[PDB]
C-alpha cells in the first residue's frame, strides 16, 4: 500500500544513512551499532545480498520493500522450519521440551531472552505442556 | 473433543504418512495382503485349481479394495493436517496430487469390476503393486547412482557389446556351415548374447574345434565385461550408504538453525499480526518509524539468517574437513602474524 | 592340588570356551568328525552301498555322541569357572542357558536312538551341524550388515522383481500361443525367474523372433539387477572389515581404563569388606564420618570413572578425527586469544 | 540400614555444604579442594550426573545413598573390568606383570601410589607371581 | 556477416566437437539411426523377411551416408575454428588426422557400394559402429584401470586357470572311461572351462559318484576365482569415479592460473608485436636496454609462472592433505620458535 | 675384461632375476612357448590329428628343455652376483634353494624322457606351468587377503551352505516320489548345489507346483549367498591396491635412511678393517681407548640408527595422520603453555 | 638476430649483476628489489629453473635468449590458457564477464591494475561485451 | 679376544661414568656432550635399548661387547642397506650420483662432512663415476 511504501521509505532513509537510494554496509554497521549490535562487514554484506537482488552492494528501497512485504507464509520456510525443529527434535516425534527450546534458542548464537522464549512457548507449545508441537506451530506460522 | 479430534486427524495423517517403525509394519502387512492376492491370481491362471480358487481370491480382492478406500478417505480427510489443505478448497487442491488423482481413478475402476477381463485383472494387480512405494524414493535413489556413474556404465555396456558382435561374427563363419544351430547370423547373435550373459540355455553351442578354440578366449572377455555393471552399481550403493551415514555423523547446522528460528520469531513478534505479543516487542524497544525499524531490522537480519541457515544446511565431510583445514592453517597464519606484530610493537619500546 | 585342580577347571573352561589358535583347531577336528558323519549318511541314502555303510556310520555316530557328552560335562562342571555359577545352584542357573538346555535335550534324544527313523536321523545330523557355532556370531554379523543396508537392498529386489513381472507378461503374450513351453502365465513366471537369475536350465526358452527381440533387452536389465545384492553385501563386508581393523588401530582407552580401575581399587580398599587392607586406607587418611568420607569420595569419583571409561570405550576413527580436529582448532583459538590477552596486558605497561 | 542412612546423612551434610538437601558442584569443588584435589566444574557436574538421577544438578541424599549402597558386584562391572584388564592385557592370556600394572595404574591419569598398587598386586595377583590373574580378581571382586 | 559467419563456423565446430548436453543428444539420435540400420541388416540376414527388407535398409543406408558426409564437411570446413588449421594448408594438415583420414576412406568406400558383398556390408556396419566414440576416451579409461590393477588381475586369472587344469585332469581320470562325454582330455578341458565360468550348457557333465564328489569341491573354488576379475574391475571403477569427483571438489589452481595469465599478458604487452598497446608498457615503465628489461623480466617471471601454474595444476586430495598437514605442523613449529625467540629477546631486557 | 666379465654376470643375474619392463617381456615370451606346448599336447590327446602332431610338439619340447637348462646355468653361475654365494661352496648352498633344487630334479627327469608315459607327460607340462611364478608372490598376496577376511568369508560359506541343505531337504520331500530326477537325498544334494551356484545344467529340476513354489524363495536366497565371496574378495583386492598405492604415496623414511647409512659408514670407517681410510677417522678425531671410543660411539649410535630406520620404515597413511594429528595438537598445547609461561614471566616484571 | 642477441646481452649484464656469464639468485633478488618487487630465494631459484636448462643455479645468457626468443605461440600454452579461462569460466560457455576477469586477474595473487586489465578486456573481449571470448583470445594469442 | 674385552672394559669405564657395571642414560648425555653432541634422554635410552638386552635401562659391559663384536656382515643389513639406497635410488637402476648422495647423506639429519662423503664415494662408487653402484657396495660391506 501507499502507506506501507511511504513508511518503508521513511525507515529506509533512517537506514539509508548516505541517502543514495540504497543502504550501504557502513550505514548498516553504524545503524546496528546505534541499536547496540556490532555487525561485521560480512554480516551487513550478507544482509545486502539477502535484500539486494540487482547485486549493487547497497540495499535500495525496492529490495527493502520486497523483503518487508513478504510474510512467513511468503517465505516457503515450512520444510526449513520443520527441518530446524526436527534437528532440535531429537526423538523425531514432533515435540521438544520448551525448556530445552529455551535452552538452545535463547542460548545459542544470536540468542534471545527468557521472556521472548516464554512467549515462543505460549505461541508454539500449543497445548502448553512444554513439548512444543513444532510442526503444528510451523504450519500455523509458516502458512 | 474437537481439538483432540483435529489432533488425532493430524497425527493419524502422518500415521498414514511416513511412520517410524510401527505403522511401517502395518503397511507392510498391507503389502502382505496385496502380494498374496497376486500369487493367488497366479494359481488362478491354471484350470486344474480353478474351483479351489475363486472364493478366496474373489472375497479377498473385495476386502482389499475395501481397505484401499479406507486408507484413501483417511488420507483425504487428513489432508488438512498440513497447512495448505483446509476446509474444502485447499484439500481439493491436495486431490490435485497426481498420485492421489490416478489412485482414485484406478480405485473406481477396481469398483467397476464388481459386476480378456482376467488379463486386465492381472494388469490391475501389477499396477496396485506399483502402488507399494508412495514417494517412490527407490527410483530417485537408483537414478541418482546411475547418472552418477553414467560414463563408466555406458563404456562398459558399449565395449562388451562390441565384443558380442565380433564374437558372434567369427563364430558364425566358423560353424555356420558345419552346425545347424548356427545358420543365420541372427542365430549366433542370440547364442553369443546368452553366452556372455552366463545364462547358458545350451540349446545351441559350438562343436567345431575351431569355434570352441576362439570361443573360450572371447568367453574370458565377454563374461567379465557383462558382469561389470552389476558389481559397479553394487559397490556404488555401498559407498554412498557409507558417506550418507557419514553426513549423518556431521550436521553441525544447529547454530544456523537457532539463529534462523530466532530471527524468525523476531519477525513473528515484529509481525504486526500480533501486537499483543510484547516479549520481543519489549525486547526490541529495550535493546535500542520505530515500529518499522524493529520490524525491518528483523526482516533484514532474519533474511540473512534464512540464507545462512540454508547454506549451512549442507556442510559435508571432506568439505568441512578442507574448509576448516585451510581455515585453521590460515587462522594460525593470522594468529602468528598478530604475534609478530604484537611483539614487534613491544620491540620499539 | 585342589587349588591347581580349580585353576585347571577354569583354564579348561575357557579352553572349551573361546580358544586362541590351538583348541580352535581342536574343535575344528570335532567339526571334521561330525561333517564326515553327515556325508556318510549321505551315501547311506543309497541302497547300492548299504552293506558297506552301517558299520562305520553306526559306530562313528556312537563315538560322536560320546565326545558330545564329554565336552558337555566339561562345560557344565567348568561352569563355576566364571563368577555366577558355583556349588550346585548357580551352575544350575547356568544350565538355564537355552543353548545348554536344548543341547542336553537333543543330547538325550541322540541317546534315544541307541535302541521314518532315518529321516529324523538326517534331520538330527542337520541340527548337530547347527551346533557348530556356539555363540552364533555369524548371524549377528550378517544381520548387522543387512539391516545396515536395508533400504538399498529392498529397492534392489523390489525393482528387479517388477522387471521380472513385466518381462514375463510381455513374453507370455509374445509366445504363449506359438510355444507350448509358455502356456500359462505361471509358466513364464517360472521361466523369466530362472532367466534373470542366470541359472538357465534351458528347458523352456523363447523361439518367437518377437520374443527373443524383447527378451535380450530385458535380459540386459534383469540380470544386472539380481546380481546387485550379491556385490552389495560383498563390498559391505570388505569395508566393514577394513573399518573394524581401523578401530583395532585406534582404541586409546588405556587412560580411562587405568583411572577406572584405580577408582575401583580405591573403592575396594574403602570397601569395608577388607579393613585389614591399609595401603589405600593409609593413602586416603594421608592424602587429606572420615571413613564414609574416604569411601563415599571414592564411590562418587569411581562412579564418574565408570562412566568416563565406558564413554571412552568407543572412540572412533573419524569420530576422534573430527573431535580433536575441532578441538585443536578451537584450542588454537583459546591459545591465541590468551596470547592476545597476555601481550595486551603487557601493552598497558 | 538406619545406621548406614544416618551416617550417610552426616557425611552428606559434610558434603552438603549449602544444606539444600542436595550437593551442589561448588560444594564438591570446595570439599575436594579441602581434601587437596582441585575438581573442575565439569568433573563435579559429572559426579552429580553419576549420582543425580532426577537431574537437578545437585546431589540429594537419596542419590548419594543409592550410589553408596551399591557394591562392585552391584555394579555389573565384570565385562567392563575385564575389558580394561584385557586392554592392559596385551597378550590376552589373562595375566599382566604387576610391575606394568603398577606402571600404568599408579602412573596413568588419576594415578595411585606404590603401596596401594602393591596391595592391588597382593589382592589381584592371586598366585603372587607379578602376573595378576585379572579375570580371577575381577570375578572375585566384581562378583 | 563474414565475422558472424566465422563465429558461427567456430561455434558449430565445437558443436560437432564436444557438446555439453544438447548436441550430445543430437549425436545420440545419430547413433540411433546407425544402430537401427544395424538391426535391420540383422533381419536382412534371413530370407523369410527379405522382400520386406531392402527398401528400408537400402534407402536408410543412403540417408546415413548422406548425413555422414554432411557432418564430415562441417568438421573439415570448421577445422580453421582452431588455431593451427587455416586457409587450405593448415586445415590440410588437419586432414592428416588419422581419424579424419580413415573416416574419409571408409566414407568413399560406402559410396562405392552405391552401384560376399553383404558380408562386407555387415563388416562395414560394424566399423561405422566403432565410429561412435570419436575420442575413444572409453578405451583410455579402461586400460587405465586395468594397468592400475595389472598384478592382482593376472594373479586371479593365472591361479584359477591352474585350478581349471587340475580339475579337468582329475575329472578326466574319474569319468573318461565311464562316460562318453569325457573321452579326450580336450573334452574335459572344454567342460571344466564352461563349468567354472558359470555358463553351464549342460551338454556334458559328470555322472560318476567319484567325479561329482571331487567336482563340487573344485566348483566352490573355481567359480569364485573366475568371478573375481568382474567384481575387481567394478569396484575399481566405483572408487576411481569417487576420487575423480573428489579432485573435482579440489582444484585450487585459480591462483597460479591468474598469475600465469598475468605474466602472460605482461609478455604480450612487452611482446613487441603490439607496441601501440601501452597499459602494460606504461605499467612497466611506471613500476620501475629498458625495453628488453621490461620484456625479459616478464619472460623470466612469466616462465616461472608457467611452471608454477602447471605444477599447481594437479594438487590432489590426500596430496594437499599431507602437504599442508606437514606444512601446518612445521609452520606452527616456526611460529612457536619465533615466539620463543621473541619472548627471549624480551628476556634480556 | 674379467671385471666387466663379473659385472655382466651380476647384471645378467638380476636380468634373470626381477626385470623392470624389458626382460619381463622376455620371460613372457618364454611363457608363450611353454603355454603353446601345453595346448599342442592338448591337441595331441586326439588321434584324429596325431600324425600332424608329434613333429612340432616333439622338437619344440626339446627346444624348451634346452632354454630351460640355459636359464638354469645362467642362474647358477650368476649366483655369486649376490654376497653369500661365491667360489663353489656358497653358490652350492645357493643350490640348496628348494626352488632351484626341485627345478633341477624335474629338469633331469625332462631329460629322462629323451629316450602311461604321455599321461605323466601332461602332468609334467602342468608342473612346468607352475614354474611360471618364481617367487610365487601371487599366493602370498591371495592368502593375505583371504586370512584378512577369514571370518566373514567363513560365515558366508557356512550360512549359505546350510541354506543348501535345508533347501535340498524340503525339495526332496516335495518331489522325491513325483519325479525320478529326485530319488535319493544325494540327488537333491547335487541338484540344489549346482542350482544355487548359478550353473544350471538343467538335467534335473522341479516339476511339482509345490517344489517350484518353495524353490524360487530359496533361489533368491542361495544364489546371493554363494555369489558373496566373489564380490567380497574382489572389492578387497581393489581396496588393498588403493591403500598400497597410498603408502606408495607416503614413505618419508629418507631421513632415517640417511642417518642409518651415515652411522653405518661411521662404523665402516671406525671398522678397523680399513684404517687407511681417514676421512671419518679424521672426522671422529676432529669432532671431539680413543679408537674404541670413536668406534663404540659409532656402534651405539649406528645401532640406534638401525632401529630408528627400521621402525621408520613403515609409517602408514592414517598412522602418520593420527600421530602427527595428536602430535600437532599436543604440540600446540606445549607451544601455548610456553606462551603463557613466557608472558607470565613478563607479568612479574 | 645479432641485434636481439646483443641487446639481450646488454640486458643480461644488467641482470647479470656479478658478471659470471649467468644470473645468480642474488642478482635476481636485488634487481627485482630495484624494480620494487621483493623476490624470495625460492622465486628467483624457480626463475633460474625456468630459464636454466643445464641446471647450474645461475641463468647464463644462452638460457635467457632461449626463453626470450619464445612467443606465446612458441609456448604451447593453448590447452593451458584455455584451462585457466575455463576454471575462471564457471559456466563453461567460453565467456566470462570482463568485470569478474578484472576482479580476479587484477585482484588475485600477483594482481595487475585496472588499466592493464582494461586493455586485457579490449584485446580479449573481442566483441567488447564484457564476456571475453577467452578461447578466441587464447587462440589469437597462444597461436 | 681378551685384548678386545679388556680394551672394551677400559672404554666402558670411560662410558660407565657411574661405574655400576652398566651405562646409564646420564652417563650417555654427559659423554656425548663431552664429544660435543647433545643427546636427548630418548636418544640415550634408545641407545640402551639397542645395547641393553636384559632390559635394565643401563648398558652393562656384556651388551656393549655384544654390540661391538658385531660387524656390518654381522648386522644382516643387506636388505636394509639396499632398501635405503633404493629409496635414495630414485630410478631404481642401482646407481645414484655421488653428488646427490653427498647432498642427502652429508646434508640429511645427522649429516656428515664433505670429506667423509668423499671417501664414501671412493669406497662406494666402485667405478668412480659419481653413480655409486650401491648394491655392489652394500654387498662388499654388509657381507
Ligand atoms: O492404491 C491404489 N492405486 C495406486 C496405484 C499406485 C500408487 Cl503409487 N498408489 C496407489 C488403488 C486403491 C483402491 C482401488 F480400488 C484400486 C487401486
Ligand atoms: O551338541 C549337541 N546339540 C547342539 C545343537 C546346537 C547347538 Cl548351537 N549346540 C549344541 C548334541 C550333543 C550331544 C547329543 F547326543 C546330541 C546333540
Ligand atoms: O564415420 C565414418 N567412419 C568412421 C569410422 C570410425 C570412426 Cl572412430 N569415425 C568415423 C563413415 C562416414 C561416412 C561413410 F560413407 C562411411 C563411414
Ligand atoms: O623349470 C623347470 N621346473 C620348475 C618348476 C617349478 C618352478 Cl616354481 N620352477 C622351475 C624345469 C626346467 C628344465 C626341465 F627340463 C624341466 C623343468
From Swiss-Prot, chains A, D, G, H:
Which disorder does the record name? Ventricular tachycardia, catecholaminergic polymorphic, 6: An arrhythmogenic disorder characterized by stress-induced, bidirectional ventricular tachycardia that may degenerate into cardiac arrest and cause sudden death. Patients present with recurrent syncope, seizures, or sudden death after physical activity or emotional stress. CPVT6 inheritance is autosomal dominant. Long QT syndrome 16: An autosomal dominant form of long QT syndrome, a heart disorder characterized by a prolonged QT interval on the ECG and polymorphic ventricular arrhythmias. They cause syncope and sudden death in response to exercise or emotional stress, and can present with a sentinel event of sudden cardiac death in infancy.
Residues where N6,N6,N6-trimethyllysine is found: 111
- Crosslink Glycyl lysine isopeptide (Lys-Gly) (interchain with G-Cter in SUMO2): position given as 17
The reported effect of residue 136 to K is: In LQT16; loss-of-function variant causing impaired negative regulation of high voltage-gated calcium channel activity; impaired regulation of cardiac muscle cell action potential; decreased calcium ion binding
A molecular function (GO) term: adenylate cyclase activator activity
Positions of modified residues (Phosphoserine): 77, 97
- Name its species: Homo sapiens
What is the official name of this protein in its record?
A: Calmodulin-3
User: What top-level branch of life does the organism fall under?
Assistant: Eukaryota
Q: Which gene encodes it?
A: CALM3
The job of this chain, per UniProt, is described as: Calmodulin acts as part of a calcium signal transduction pathway by mediating the control of a large number of enzymes, ion channels, aquaporins and other proteins through calcium-binding. Calcium-binding is required for the activation of calmodulin. Among the enzymes to be stimulated by the calmodulin-calcium complex are a number of protein kinases, such as myosin light-chain kinases and calmodulin-dependent protein kinase type II (CaMK2), and phosphatases.
Residues of the region (Necessary and sufficient for interaction with PCP4) are 72-143
**Binding-site list for Ca(2+) 2:** 52, 54, 56, 58, 63
Cellular localisation: Cytoplasm, Cytoskeleton, Spindle; Cytoplasm, Cytoskeleton, Spindle pole; Cytoplasm, Cytoskeleton, Microtubule organizing center, Centrosome
| Modification type Phosphotyrosine: residues | 95, 134
Has keyword Ubl conjugation? yes
Residues annotated as binding Ca(2+) 3: 89, 91, 93, 95, 100
Q: Where does the chain bind Ca(2+) 4? A: 125, 127, 129, 131, 136
Among InterPro entries, the record links this protein to: CALM/Myosin/TropC-like (IPR050230), EF-hand-dom_pair (IPR011992), EF_Hand_1_Ca_BS (IPR018247), EF_hand_dom (IPR002048)
Subunit structure, as described in the record:
Interacts with MYO1C, MYO5A and RRAD. Interacts with MYO10. Interacts with CEP97, CCP110, TTN/titin and SRY. Interacts with USP6; the interaction is calcium dependent. Interacts with CDK5RAP2. Interacts with SCN5A. Interacts with RYR1. Interacts with FCHO1. Interacts with MIP in a 1:2 stoichiometry; the interaction with the cytoplasmic domains from two MIP subunits promotes MIP water channel closure. Interacts with ORAI1; this may play a role in the regulation of ORAI1-mediated calcium transport. Interacts with IQCF1. Interacts with SYT7. (Microbial infection) Interacts with C.violaceum CopC. C.violaceum CopC interacts specifically with the apo form of calmodulin.
Curated annotation (Swiss-Prot), chains B, C, E, F:
* Stretches of the chain found on the membrane's Extracellular side: 45-54, 175-184, 198-208
Please tell me, according to the UniProt entry, what happens when changing residue 205 to C: In BFNS1; 30%-60% reduction of wt current in heteromeric channels
Spans traversing the lipid bilayer: 22-44, 55-76, 95-114, 118-136, 149-174, 209-235
Annotated positions of the Phosphothreonine modification: 138
Report what the Swiss-Prot or TrEMBL entry states about this protein's PTMs.
KCNQ2/KCNQ3 are ubiquitinated by NEDD4L. Ubiquitination leads to protein degradation. Degradation induced by NEDD4L is inhibited by USP36.
Q: Where is this region: Mediates interaction with SLC5A3/SMIT1?
A: 143-244
Altering residue 129 to V: what's the impact? Answer: In BFNS1; minor effect on maximal current but clearly exhibits a faster rate of deactivation
Effect of altering residue 200 to S? More than 50% reduction of wt heteromeric current. Ratio of 1:1 and 1:1:2
Domain of life of the native organism: Eukaryota
Changing residue 128 to Q does what? Found in a patient with isolated myokymia; leads to a shift of voltage-dependent activation
Upon changing residue 252 to A, the result is:
No difference in PIP2 sensitivity
What is the annotated localization of this protein?
Cell membrane
Q: Where is this motif: Selectivity filter?
A: 198-203
Where, by tissue, is this protein expressed? In adult and fetal brain. Highly expressed in areas containing neuronal cell bodies, low in spinal cord and corpus callosum. Isoform 2 is preferentially expressed in differentiated neurons. Isoform 6 is prominent in fetal brain, undifferentiated neuroblastoma cells and brain tumors.
Q: What is the effect of changing residue 122 to C?
A: In DEE7; gain-of-function mutation; results in loss of voltage-dependent channel gating and highly increased potassium currents
List the residue ranges forming a coiled coil, or say none: none
**Domain-related comment:** Each subunit contains six transmembrane segments (S1-S6) with S1-S4 forming one voltage sensing domain (VSD) and S5-S6 contributing to form one quarter of an interlocking pore-forming domain (PD). The S4-S5 linker preferentially interacts with PIP2 in the open-state KCNQ2 channel, whereas the S2-S3 loop interacts with PIP2 in the closed state.
Subunit relationships:
Heterotetramer with KCNQ3; forms heterotetrameric M-channel responsible for the native M-current. Homotetrameric; forms a functional homotetrameric channel resulting in the expression of a small M-current. Interacts with calmodulin; the interaction is calcium-independent, constitutive and participates in the proper assembly of a functional M-channel. May associate with KCNE2. Interacts with IQCJ-SCHIP1. Interacts (via the pore module) with SLC5A3/SMIT1; forms a coregulatory complex that alters ion selectivity, voltage dependence and gating kinetics of the channel.
Q: What is this protein called?
A: Potassium voltage-gated channel subfamily KQT member 2
Which residues of the full-length protein are shown here? Answer: 70 to 595 of 872
